[PDB]
Scaffold this active site. Structure first.
Site, PDB file in Angstrom:
ATOM      1  N   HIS A  72      25.577  23.672  31.266  1.00 41.56           N
ATOM      2  CA  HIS A  72      25.761  23.900  29.836  1.00 41.56           C
ATOM      3  C   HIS A  72      26.599  22.781  29.225  1.00 41.56           C
ATOM      4  CE1 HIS A  72      24.678  28.457  29.556  1.00 41.56           C
ATOM      5  NE2 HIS A  72      23.926  27.832  30.444  1.00 41.56           N
ATOM      6  N   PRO A 293      39.967  36.781  31.518  1.00 45.92           N
ATOM      7  CA  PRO A 293      38.662  36.106  31.652  1.00 45.92           C
ATOM      8  C   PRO A 293      38.125  35.264  30.490  1.00 45.92           C
ATOM      9  CG  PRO A 293      38.413  38.472  31.556  1.00 45.92           C
ATOM     10  CD  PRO A 293      39.860  38.222  31.777  1.00 45.92           C
TER      11      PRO A 293
HETATM   12  C1  LIG Z   1      35.094  40.249  34.251  1.00 46.60           C
HETATM   13  C2  LIG Z   1      35.563  38.942  34.915  1.00 46.60           C
HETATM   14  C3  LIG Z   1      34.993  37.774  34.577  1.00 46.60           C
HETATM   15  C4  LIG Z   1      35.390  36.575  35.164  1.00 46.60           C
HETATM   16  N1  LIG Z   1      34.784  35.467  34.802  1.00 46.60           N
HETATM   17  C5  LIG Z   1      35.173  34.311  35.294  1.00 46.60           C
HETATM   18  C6  LIG Z   1      34.391  33.040  35.009  1.00 46.60           C
HETATM   19  O1  LIG Z   1      33.390  33.010  34.284  1.00 46.60           O
HETATM   20  N2  LIG Z   1      34.980  31.855  35.507  1.00 46.60           N
HETATM   21  C7  LIG Z   1      36.163  31.864  36.288  1.00 46.60           C
HETATM   22  O2  LIG Z   1      36.681  30.842  36.745  1.00 46.60           O
HETATM   23  N3  LIG Z   1      36.756  33.111  36.617  1.00 46.60           N
HETATM   24  C8  LIG Z   1      36.303  34.255  36.178  1.00 46.60           C
HETATM   25  N4  LIG Z   1      36.832  35.413  36.654  1.00 46.60           N
HETATM   26  C9  LIG Z   1      37.793  35.518  37.831  1.00 46.60           C
HETATM   27  C10 LIG Z   1      37.378  35.356  39.256  1.00 46.60           C
HETATM   28  O3  LIG Z   1      36.325  36.309  39.455  1.00 46.60           O
HETATM   29  C11 LIG Z   1      38.541  35.569  40.188  1.00 46.60           C
HETATM   30  O4  LIG Z   1      39.528  34.614  39.834  1.00 46.60           O
HETATM   31  C12 LIG Z   1      38.119  35.285  41.634  1.00 46.60           C
HETATM   32  O5  LIG Z   1      37.381  36.430  42.163  1.00 46.60           O
HETATM   33  C13 LIG Z   1      39.317  35.099  42.593  1.00 46.60           C
HETATM   34  O6  LIG Z   1      38.896  34.897  43.931  1.00 46.60           O
HETATM   35  P1  LIG Z   1      39.862  35.118  45.205  1.00 46.60           P
HETATM   36  O7  LIG Z   1      39.066  34.704  46.324  1.00 46.60           O
HETATM   37  O8  LIG Z   1      41.161  34.484  44.906  1.00 46.60           O
HETATM   38  O9  LIG Z   1      40.105  36.665  45.188  1.00 46.60           O
HETATM   39  P2  LIG Z   1      39.124  37.898  45.277  1.00 46.60           P
HETATM   40  O10 LIG Z   1      37.768  37.711  44.738  1.00 46.60           O
HETATM   41  O11 LIG Z   1      39.899  38.999  44.696  1.00 46.60           O
HETATM   42  O12 LIG Z   1      38.958  38.198  46.857  1.00 46.60           O
HETATM   43  C14 LIG Z   1      40.062  38.478  47.702  1.00 46.60           C
HETATM   44  C15 LIG Z   1      39.532  39.108  48.973  1.00 46.60           C
HETATM   45  O13 LIG Z   1      40.620  39.494  49.789  1.00 46.60           O
HETATM   46  C16 LIG Z   1      40.435  40.810  50.329  1.00 46.60           C
HETATM   47  N5  LIG Z   1      41.662  41.502  50.667  1.00 46.60           N
HETATM   48  C17 LIG Z   1      42.471  42.239  49.830  1.00 46.60           C
HETATM   49  N6  LIG Z   1      43.461  42.820  50.487  1.00 46.60           N
HETATM   50  C18 LIG Z   1      43.300  42.391  51.811  1.00 46.60           C
HETATM   51  C19 LIG Z   1      44.013  42.657  52.960  1.00 46.60           C
HETATM   52  N7  LIG Z   1      45.129  43.377  52.935  1.00 46.60           N
HETATM   53  N8  LIG Z   1      43.536  42.170  54.111  1.00 46.60           N
HETATM   54  C20 LIG Z   1      42.403  41.506  54.144  1.00 46.60           C
HETATM   55  N9  LIG Z   1      41.606  41.265  53.130  1.00 46.60           N
HETATM   56  C21 LIG Z   1      42.167  41.667  51.955  1.00 46.60           C
HETATM   57  C22 LIG Z   1      39.616  41.569  49.323  1.00 46.60           C
HETATM   58  O14 LIG Z   1      38.814  42.576  49.945  1.00 46.60           O
HETATM   59  C23 LIG Z   1      38.760  40.446  48.735  1.00 46.60           C
HETATM   60  O15 LIG Z   1      37.530  40.403  49.472  1.00 46.60           O
HETATM   61  C24 LIG Z   1      36.423  36.580  36.138  1.00 46.60           C
HETATM   62  C25 LIG Z   1      36.989  37.794  36.524  1.00 46.60           C
HETATM   63  C26 LIG Z   1      36.569  38.942  35.976  1.00 46.60           C
HETATM   64  C27 LIG Z   1      37.244  40.208  36.442  1.00 46.60           C
END
Ligand SMILES: Cc1cc2nc3c(=O)[nH]c(=O)nc-3n(C[C@H](O)[C@H](O)[C@H](O)COP(=O)(O)OP(=O)(O)OC[C@H]3O[C@@H](n4cnc5c(N)ncnc54)[C@H](O)[C@@H]3O)c2cc1C
Ligand SMILES: Cc1cc2nc3c(=O)[nH]c(=O)nc-3n(C[C@H](O)[C@H](O)[C@H](O)COP(=O)(O)OP(=O)(O)OC[C@H]3O[C@@H](n4cnc5c(N)ncnc54)[C@H](O)[C@@H]3O)c2cc1C
EC number: 1.14.13.2
Lengths: 391, 391
Positions: A72, A293
């Site tokens: 985009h 978000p």
């Molecule tokens: C509605 C919405 C829209 C969004 N849109 C955007 C977008 O367009 N662009 C953008 O950049 N961001 C966007 N985001 C944000 C983005 O989705 C998150 O920042 C991203 O998922 C973070 O990834 P992560 O791997 O840090 O954490 P997470 O996706 O939260 O994953 C962490 C993992 O750790 C695991 N975990 C938790 N506790 C434990 C434990 N004790 N032991 C072992 N495993 C554990 C969980 O099960 C999970 O699988 C959006 C978020 C939302 C909610």
């Protein structure tokens, strides 16, 4: 068991870090609390910055993205009966963003890890971190009722907002900055062609609305709702009627609606913790910070934290330069605070806040008019939206 | 008596409008509640936009200004142990601002009016406006105990925040947008050389500070103070000690202090009224809106209101195009809301607000770092500071 880098969480952060490290020859084990299916059920993100796109290419997991991703060059903001387009490409110096669902990114990474043979333990229950300040930290967990111990040199806490990682650092060592917004986003995924080739962020008196997409026959829409709302009180029908009411008439009449594949409410919040490390533990992604978000920065900040941690771990292992790791938090925090400020601004100018006086409403409207009508104003939105440079 | 345009208030707005109209052949009478001396006692403004500089030249009252005014090409912002300079000239496309005291501007205009022979009635007590919606509005007042009546075609309310003008419009016809800040500015005028060739706006934990000037041997300094403060509680000595504490060490050691010529506290507030006219009455300057002094926009917005009203009155008289006057408020309000938004931003990033959480403080600091470190961020400050184009 023993490994070099232990990674808590198999979401995009943990998987991306794990893939980059594996490719560089640094062994890592990923521990995930849930099942592969649970992780794959989350819709979440849709917008990716160029920096993340390049990092996926470097980790060698960009085939399907290069093929199915949508590049985009602009986005649109609708307010007060106007629809202004921000030419991201022109105003940011040629940069653009890519639309490719977080579910797809995660699936691609999971498949890449599976093929490589690297260790991933799903359903790792009761994960606990130990001796974070020692030279030999270790992680204990339960798998099939039996508690195993995993020894390592470093631990990457990639377990999201509610992970065990951040909770394992002595509370007194961290300073938390948080803001909780008085509203959430009700999202709806539908197997219908999007209403526009570009995204539309709408400020409407009834509240915020957003028209997004995943592909040419899949759309993702959102509407601002109070925190008291329950998803069960929002039928597909009620959702469509409300969305239509918040969009420009010409946009609302071209809208193809349809039954939802997914519907959920995500509450909005800003959250930062300083520092982002403790001894041999380094926090990355949502484990360290949350952005509303509105600015599409969450997954994108996770990517830059991961790129930073990966490059510092490479110097530590490959070049014996372990001292460099001390700089992790300073480097990441600079980029994080700027993306938090941008997500905060975007959130404040596009949403309807409860109990806003006449003066504040006029200023909010004037912010849009000034920024969308000035070449310099447009540039500040564009450079921030495409994503500021990695350090 | 009768005239064409009756002007309430002999501050800079009324005098400037009166001079422009007189030069164009349109008779006007100015009614001032105070004495010439009282008006000349107010220090107020120090920074003038290019648009105001050109308007003074057009009214033929720029000799002394062109000679004694100081043209500034940049300003500086000090925060978190840094001092960043904004090159206004380069970032705004060649525009600059002029430092010339409001007292001087007023004195120049008063002398120009005196010489021209136009009517000015000082100590005009109990001014009341009548038949604002009629074809023949009139003003009554008391001079030497005798109530006189002045007939006219139009009335320009240039009587400031507490003037009679705005109070004469039916309350139900106006919508007020106002914000009162929890602090004021304690200002001090001293006959000493300024500490810098350019202005320095400082964000310090103890609160805001500003280093300004009037000439090479006259300075004007300000420090943010709570609304509970009394000027009598601030000796010159206490003021200097506090200022020094809020400035960069290298700036504080070069500071030449001295006894104050003037000291006073100005509370901060944002205020806008819509519309800015009623029948044959048109509000201009502080009578219609107030901006916090942080962005140096008050006198400058008065100038653009006056330029707009003057040009519309010319078409009405000279070309019989009276319908045009209906557009006064729409034209002025566009520029006013943008300057209000800028003064609001400047105020929010440079001042210490009571009861600010850790998150807000970090965002405030990040706003400065982002805007002062980005070429696009710098440009938004510069174009707004030099002053946006007149419509
Ligand atoms: C509605 C919405 C829209 C969004 N849109 C955007 C977008 O367009 N662009 C953008 O950049 N961001 C966007 N985001 C944000 C983005 O989705 C998150 O920042 C991203 O998922 C973070 O990834 P992560 O791997 O840090 O954490 P997470 O996706 O939260 O994953 C962490 C993992 O750790 C695991 N975990 C938790 N506790 C434990 C434990 N004790 N032991 C072992 N495993 C554990 C969980 O099960 C999970 O699988 C959006 C978020 C939302 C909610
Ligand atoms: C500390 C401070 C710093 C500032 N710095 C700047 C700067 O650097 N740049 C900038 O652009 N602005 C600045 N301003 C603002 C600027 O000084 C005001 O915007 C400006 O004085 C407005 O002029 P005016 O003619 O509209 O009103 P005023 O100066 O308020 O004059 C109105 C006149 O009307 C008269 N009047 C009132 N009631 C009546 C009545 N009933 N009948 C008859 N006469 C009446 C009053 O006596 C007064 O003489 C600053 C203000 C302050 C307080």
């Amino acid at each position: 068991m023993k490994t070099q880098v232990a990674i808590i969480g198999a979401g995009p952060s943990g998987l991306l870090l794990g893939q980059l490290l594996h490719k560089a020859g640094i062994d890592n084990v990923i521990l995930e609390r849930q099942t592969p299916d649970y992780v794959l059920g989350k819709i979440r993100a849709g917008v990716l910055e160029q920096g993340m796109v390049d990092l996926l290419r470097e980790a060698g997991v960009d085939r399907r993205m290069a093929r199915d991703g949508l590049v985009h060059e602009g986005v649109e903001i609708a307010f007060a009966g106007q629809r202004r387009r921000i030419d991201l490409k022109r105003l940011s110096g040629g940069k653009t963003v890519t639309v490719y669902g977080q579910t797809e990114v995660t699936r691609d990474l999971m498949e890449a890890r599976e093929a490589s043979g690297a260790t991933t333990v799903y359903q790792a229950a009761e994960v606990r971190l130990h001796d974070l300040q020692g030279e030999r930290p270790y992680v204990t967990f339960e798998r099939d009722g039996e508690r195993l111990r995993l020894d390592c040199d470093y631990i990457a806490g990639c377990d999201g907002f509610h992970g065990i990682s951040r909770q394992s650092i002595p509370a007194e060592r961290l300073k938390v900055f948080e803001r909780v917004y008085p509203f959430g986003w009700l999202g709806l995924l539908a197997d219908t062609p999007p209403v526009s080739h570009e995204l539309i962020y709408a400020n409407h008196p009834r509240g915020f609305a957003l028209c997004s997409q995943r592909s040419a026959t899949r759309s993702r829409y959102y509407v601002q709702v109070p925190l008291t709302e329950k998803v069960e009180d929002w039928s597909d029908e009620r959702f469509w009627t409300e969305l239509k009411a918040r969009l420009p008439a010409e946009v609302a009449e071209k809208l193809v609606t349809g039954p939802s594949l997914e519907k959920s409410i995500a509450p909005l919040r800003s959250f930062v913790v300083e520092p982002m490390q403790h001894g041999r533990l380094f926090l990355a992604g949502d484990a360290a910070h949350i952005v509303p978000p509105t600015g599409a920065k969450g997954l994108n900040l996770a990517a830059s934290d991961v790129s930073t941690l990966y490059r510092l771990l490479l110097k530590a292992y490959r070049e014996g330069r372990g001292e460099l790791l001390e700089r992790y938090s300073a480097i990441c925090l600079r980029r994080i605070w700027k993306a938090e400020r941008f997500s905060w601004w975007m959130t404040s100018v596009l949403h309807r806040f409860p109990d806003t006086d006449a003066f504040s409403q006029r200023i909010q409207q004037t912010e849009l008019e000034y920024y969308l009508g000035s070449e310099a104003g447009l540039a500040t939105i564009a450079e921030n939206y495409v994503g500021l440079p990695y350090e």
